[PDB]
């Protein structure tokens, strides 16, 4: 069978903390009245679910709605307490309240409203700055919820919010969210298509906090290169082949021999025999004004097939490419 | 109803700044992972929070962690936003992280450590030169904090650290402060009993940065005479009557027809009649060698019932009892 793995950093936060922390299936939740909130409009269709901009009727502030379609109430325990559990972190979304309508008793999470700034007009006003401002602001909020002992595993630009007048961010969408326990094998079939670890790709279920850690690679190539998404894959088995077209075939065969990963059949006839890229081949006349010797020197130790060899949040902050910011 | 007063000293300073700096209630905490601090030993107790010593695991110094009993969210909001913007000011404790526990989700705040000094252990062997010395560190701490626009309205003894060994001083116990806008009507459920000046007591609710001067002339007080605590009230009420043993009762009827205020019930059977008495007949053999005219003069000019006449910060620190320092 596969070798097994475990996390760098964190490894046990969960295991030396009492069961109430983890234990969510057990966890009771108190579901308030909805009718301190009125519902304005629409804002997305989170991921099984629809947010909402609101008014609390109590204090006159606006706030956000995420009306949850209860298709696993486990899934919800679940959520609520990863939510409770990072419940005031840095660049996390904050859970406000937990409530149902009277009539329609659907599950709907209340939190701290986000003013979110149109990125698909200012994509083209970023600059280099701006870029490693954001990503910090990121690593911040994945090093607090690593060291708490969770994986997002659904990093992706959807579920990064932006104030970009107030140079706010919040991670939001915790509802793939798990806790890690060393050994413990998780369902790959989690974050989006063109963000999953090659992990996920292969089947090997004992990952961690790194999965994280490729979808924020994968953020970064994608915005200092301006080529969305960076790994176009068309299905999960194409993904791992569009992934082989940049880091080369070689590295990924020493990663499934590293773990003992049987590589599923399906990969046969089109996985192919691709050369390592060198990351310069991607700067263009469109993206130069992004990329730096720093910043492609830190997306290279992100996007590492091996998930135990990938940069942690709290390495991350400490890489060149964030020496000028704050 | 009550004539309307404003600070004599940094009255427009919250009025020149946007809301941001003083608008608590809308301030984001960040509330960090507390797993970085291992909790030692317990060090002190407060009304609504306790003192723990600490390591930070990730650099191996010393903090000292304050647990606060969430019992108003407002009031976490209000201590944390005044402690950031006076963050790394003259004498004021260093707010060094927000934290919660995991598990317990107890709103924590993690300050600089301080080597205290035994209140009651230095007592014996402090000279006057200490008091001199030390009471100038306690004012620059309020000049820069009044400068901040904010009120620290809970000075006390037990609100100021020393290290002796070191000679340093720190302001702590920010959860009272408020941030001082001209006009404004505040609490006066505020400072400790022997502390409270007497606009708190009459329930005059238009005070300033003047509160704190009182509250110091109370400290000075029980210092130079050694009578600890100078004005012992025994309830809120009675408070008001021994600081009219001391002050008389015609400089407090001048006040409150001054400030047009009406005078609780309450104060009818036991305000009684005073006279003014001179300060130096709180002069015995056990504290004449911490007394001097430079001393009463100073404290002459603190402790009046009038909270606009006290001295300022930034006037005490010009005071001929500070020439040595
Ligand atoms: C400069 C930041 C950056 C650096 C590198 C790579 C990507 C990005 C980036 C680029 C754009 C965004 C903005 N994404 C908004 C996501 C989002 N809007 C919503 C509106 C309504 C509802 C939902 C769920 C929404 N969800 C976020 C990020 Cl993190
Ligand atoms: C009469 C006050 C006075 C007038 C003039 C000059 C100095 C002082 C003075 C001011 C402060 C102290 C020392 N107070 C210690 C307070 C204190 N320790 C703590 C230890 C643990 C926890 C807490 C909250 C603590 N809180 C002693 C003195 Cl002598």
């Excluded at 559990?85 to 009277?102: E, F, H, Q, S």
């Excluded at 700034?117 to 870029?131: A, C, G, R, S, V």
């Excluded at 969770?150 to 969408?173: A, C, F, S, T």
């Excluded at 990952?207 to 080529?227: E, H, N, Q, T, V």
Aim: overall charge neutral.
């Amino acid at each position: 069978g596969p070798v097994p793995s475990r996390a760098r950093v964190y490894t046990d936060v969960n295991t030396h903390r009492p069961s109430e922390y983890w234990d969510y299936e057990s966890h009771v939740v108190e579901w308030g009245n909805q009718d301190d909130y009125q519902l304005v409009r629409k804002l997305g269709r989170g991921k099984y679910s629809e947010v909402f901009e609101a008014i609390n009727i109590t204090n006159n502030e606006k706030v956000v709605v995420k009306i949850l379609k209860p298709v696993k109430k486990k899934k919800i325990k679940r959520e609520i307490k990863i939510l409770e559990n990072l419940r005031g972190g840095p660049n996390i979304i904050t859970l406000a309240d937990i409530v149902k309508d009277p009539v329609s008793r659907t599950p709907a999470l209340v939190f701290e409203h986000v003013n979110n700034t149109d990125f698909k007009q200012l994509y083209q006003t970023l600059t280099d700055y701006d870029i490693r401002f954001y990503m910090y602001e990121i690593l911040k909020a994945l090093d607090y919820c690593h060291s708490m002992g969770i994986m997002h595993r659904d990093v992706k630009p959807h579920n990064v919010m932006i104030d970009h007048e107030h140079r706010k961010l919040r991670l939001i969408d915790w509802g793939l969210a798990e806790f890690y326990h060393p050994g413990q094998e998780y369902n790959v079939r989690v974050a989006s298509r063109y963000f999953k670890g090659p992990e996920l790709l292969v089947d090997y279920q004992m990952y961690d906090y790194s999965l994280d850690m490729w979808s924020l690679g994968c953020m970064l190539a994608s915005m200092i290169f301006r080529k969305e998404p960076f790994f176009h894959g068309h299905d999960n088995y194409d993904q791992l082949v569009r992934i082989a077209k940049v880091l080369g075939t070689e590295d990924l065969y020493d990663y499934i021999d590293k773990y003992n990963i049987e590589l599923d059949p399906r990969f046969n006839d089109i996985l192919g025999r691709h050369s390592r890229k060198r990351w310069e081949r991607f700067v263009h006349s469109e993206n130069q004004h992004l990329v730096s010797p720093e910043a492609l020197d830190f997306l290279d130790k992100l996007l590492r097939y091996d998930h135990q060899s990938r940069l942690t949040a709290r390495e991350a902050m400490e890489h060149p490419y964030f020496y000028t910011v704050v």
